Design a protein around this ligand. Structure first.
Ligand SMILES: COc1ccc(CN(CC[C@@]2(C(C)C)CCOC(C)(C)C2)C(=O)c2ccco2)cc1
Ligand SMILES: COc1ccc(CN(CC[C@@]2(C(C)C)CCOC(C)(C)C2)C(=O)c2ccco2)cc1
Ligand SMILES: NC(=O)c1cccnc1
Ligand SMILES: NC(=O)c1cccnc1
Ligand SMILES: [Cl-]
Ligand SMILES: [Cl-]
Ligand SMILES: [Cl-]
Lengths: 468, 466
């Protein structure tokens, strides 16, 4: 990886555009106000460690960048002297200070999350060079936030239909490995989901957490044996029952998920599980349920009909809240068409039909890890303060046609209000000490990571109020 | 990277689930029934992740240790992975056949097939589904970028009478707006199949390493301002910022974001009056490109053109459309996706503005606002051999006929009328439809056929270009 080639092309030309005698450029990241009222701050530590810390500049990396940019711009605009200064003066360590809110912190929209400034006047251009790399923090923030918003929905309906939150942390499983844009995205997004939940098939998340964050536990996430269409259909259309019997016999003493919609989900539930193989299900341990997996049709209609079928073939109980409960050897996972909108529709539809949320778990792939943009929380990096000719200037944009794109002015700090909420103070007003100490911590300075969070601390920070 | 840790967790358990006496699992990828897709990106995945010695003793032990904790159970196929290590020096006993990269193929056609070449590794075909299915992303970026090229080509031809500058009309602004550094490189490279303009530098190194071009680089950019380089001058000094930037870049094209405070003021009073002398003096090879970046994308473009048309000498081209002087152009780089791009060029045509006047920048719309569901990219088992007998295999869910999968051994053919057909159930072997367009690209740990980026661009050309 070469940080000289890890920026938007136009940033190569910016050192020539700032006012002459600029010694400081100070910038900040926020999830701008435009429901998603609060965001989980997660993922900066990965970026600091993988891309920004240590000797990130070499003679070879400067020459490679110079040669690429000569052809890319058909011109010599690359700041070879600027990058040589960092190599010679700081042994290729970035003279940058980053201050950040602690990872896992849940912060309302429109608040400073991190700030970036140069620590050497010669490197005024370096602050916004690394905008592109740092702004990619939008992705883990947005995955972690969207995953937590789904946990809030599941927690509300599980508490209402069961009276407790038992099994909440296994109710939204990451199915998204095949449905993301790259191996690197898979690791980052799966790790962001595991801030809120413990169930993942995106194995890439485990190694990222272990290398960059750390857990007391051997692994941060768990899975179970499960079928796919290929392991059912390989037996032939007329032998679906033989596939089912083989798979539940192979996994007789652990939980096993079996996709049941290869030909006819309703037939599979009522005739194959419900009659032909019923003797192999009712014998199973509470620690080894069969989880029936529909994977096609209208998500709500399919879940309700599957539960109606299973409710007639298996002994249903009524829990202490008056909701119906399958026997403990039998559960359902809906792994198709799940996003934050359909998840809400399904748990509401189950509640209206008196089915406990105890009965169901969700799998989400594209909806969880891919169907998200930087526009969802309006993640944005802007210059708010410069020093030119030794004089500090509060700087901002304020486009006439979009007040939502107005940026904050001057040196920023994050504070608790007297009522215990968050406020971002602008124009250096944090210095007045009317709001106590700045909640941002220096996490990066002059090529070193200076403060860091375990994955266990991030999980505690990101807990729901209902969990607390 | 450890390929034993690069699958969906459940695939770790599938070797126990296949019918006993299964010697072959044969699987295919299609974009299930955006009427045609650009096949691009498989060669990246083959080289980066699948080729050479991908299994070691250390990688087997590491997978075993992770899976023991992940499943709280010993289900990992240590024996199967150790067999590949000892028998084949850790080279995957897999054969992949693929349509050539850059080929534009209608929906619902086989694009590549995967099968095991050793009966012991029946389980390996679908192990690598997860890695291979990520080809959805470069296919979808390349396809969506090409569909935007079709819209731009149509309106440029109608309003100008030619396609000059088409290849610079959709610029990649997406580096900050994608999920990772790796996604940036793959997505940017997929866009460059169709266009030559990118700020996503990561695409250049990917193309050089995995595909190659005759030209030094596949993609180009221009000096351009950002809000930081304008706003740093202070609110009262926007004119000083513009003057400094166009003077620093007097001899090359320069893009200047003009909406920091008031885009309409900047166009009419700063560019249009105060600094007009620095603009009308510029070369045809060194235009000012004014960049709005806020408000309604269509309304803002139309009002910016109306303003510039009243301050600068406009001509009428041979098609009757209004053309700014050659030293002055516009780039709309905010809120651009395939839907709004169409709205903007249609709105310009109705107001008699040539598409010659404008280029588009697209970030999230181009590289991030896409899913595997857009072209229904999907990998399914179509054929197995069990007890030495070949069986046609498929799914056909009662509640969704759109998820019905193809049966048996597949081949891709030209029809008599020059279209495409996928033959099922091994009917390619009858040879009624000429040569299979699938070629072996990977066999037993070796990439057997490669394409240059130059070949891929040729294959993905528009009809209007031909
Ligand atoms: C990938 O497929 C999945 C994933 C998660 C679930 C939810 N699970 C399994 C939970 C456990 C882990 C290892 C996933 C943890 C708690 O107790 C156990 C039952 C012993 C195992 C369920 O039992 C379930 C499904 C629907 C409602 O409840 C079901 C299927
Ligand atoms: C990133 O900002 C951009 C990118 C591309 C454009 C389009 N360009 C510049 C094209 C060239 C660049 C991309 C190397 C190639 C052709 O010849 C030149 C005019 C000399 C230069 C334009 O001139 C333009 C904008 C709107 C309509 O036309 C404009 C702004
Ligand atoms: N474990 C599963 O059922 C699963 C995993 C990934 C994608 N689809 C389903
Ligand atoms: N060159 C540009 O104007 C640009 C690049 C990346 C993102 N936004 C704008
Ligand atoms: Cl599946
Ligand atoms: Cl080895
Ligand atoms: Cl910008």
């Amino acid at each position: 990886f070469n940080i000289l080639l890890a920026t938007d092309s136009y940033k190569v030309t910016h050192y020539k555009q700032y006012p002459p005698n600029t010694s400081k450029v100070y910038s900040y990241f926020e999830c701008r106000e435009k429901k998603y009222e609060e965001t989980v701050f997660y993922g900066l530590q990965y970026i600091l460690n993988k891309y920004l810390k240590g000797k990130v500049v070499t003679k070879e990396k400067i020459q490679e960048a110079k040669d690429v940019y000569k052809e890319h711009f058909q011109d010599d605009v690359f700041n070879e002297k600027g990058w040589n200064y960092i190599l010679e003066k700081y042994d290729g360590h970035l003279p940058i200070e980053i201050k950040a809110v602690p990872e896992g912190f849940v912060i309302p929209r429109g608040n400073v999350l991190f700030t970036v400034e140069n620590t050497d006047p010669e490197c005024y251009w370096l602050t916004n060079w690394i905008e592109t790399i740092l702004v990619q923090s939008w992705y883990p923030i947005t995955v972690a936030t969207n995953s937590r918003e789904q946990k809030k929905i599941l927690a509300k309906y599980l508490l209402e239909t069961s009276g407790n939150l038992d099994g909440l942390e296994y109710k939204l499983h990451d199915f998204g490995y095949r449905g993301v844009s790259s191996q690197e995205t898979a690791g980052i997004g799966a790790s962001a989901h595991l801030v809120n939940f413990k169930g993942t098939d995106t194995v890439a998340g485990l190694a990222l957490i272990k290398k960059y964050y750390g857990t007391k536990d051997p692994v941060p996430g768990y899975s179970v044996p499960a079928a796919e269409h290929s392991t059912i259909t390989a037996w032939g259309k007329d032998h679906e029952k033989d596939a089912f019997e083989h798979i539940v016999t192979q996994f007789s003493s652990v939980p096993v998920s079996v996709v049941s919609d290869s030909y006819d989900i309703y037939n599979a539930c009522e005739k194959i599980w419900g009659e032909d193989l019923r003797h192999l299900i009712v014998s199973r341990s509470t620690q080894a349920p069969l989880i029936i997996r529909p994977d096609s049709g209208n998500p709500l209609d399919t879940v309700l009909k599957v539960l109606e079928i299973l409710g007639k073939k298996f002994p249903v109980t009524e829990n202490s809240k008056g909701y119906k409960l399958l026997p403990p050897y039998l559960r359902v996972i809906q792994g198709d068409g799940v996003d934050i909108n359909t998840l809400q529709e399904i748990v509401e539809g189950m509640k209206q039909k008196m089915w406990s949320i105890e009965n169901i778990a969700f799998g989400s792939g594209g909806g969880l890890l891919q169907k998200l943009t930087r526009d969802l929380l309006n993640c944005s990096f802007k210059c708010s303060y410069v020093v030119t000719n030794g004089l500090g200037i509060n700087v901002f944009k304020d486009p006439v046609a979009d007040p939502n794109k107005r940026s904050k002015k001057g040196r920023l700090s994050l504070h608790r209000t007297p009522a215990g909420n968050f406020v971002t103070l602008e124009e250096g007003k944090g210095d007045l000490e009317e709001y106590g100490q700045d909640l941002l911590h220096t996490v990066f300075k002059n090529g070193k990571v200076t403060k860091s969070y375990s994955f266990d601390e991030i999980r505690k920070n990101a807990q729901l109020n209902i969990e607390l």
